[PDB]
A = this chain, B = another copy of it.
Amino acid sequence: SYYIDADLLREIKQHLKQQQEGLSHLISIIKDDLEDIKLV
């Protein structure tokens, strides 16, 4: 049978992966601002 929302689920997943990459990028910017800390 044809799953009527197949293309939609694929699109939602792709958007979520893009958003996940955005969060990774944010986390990376934060890590880069903290990376030179030797102690705390």
Interface residues of A (CB under 8 A from B): 1-13, 15-20, 22-27, 29-31, 33-34, 37, 39-40
Contacts and interface: CB of A to CB of B under 8 A. Distances in A.
A2 to B, nearest CB: 4
A contact face: mostly helix, strand, loop, or mixed: helix
Contacts of A20: 20, 23-24, 27
Contacts of A12: 9, 12, 26, 29-30
Query: Which of the listed residues A8, A25, A29, A33 has the most CB atoms from chain B within 10 Å of its own CB?
Result: A8
Contacts of A25: 15
A4 B33 contact: yes
Contacts of A6: 1-4, 34, 37, 39-40
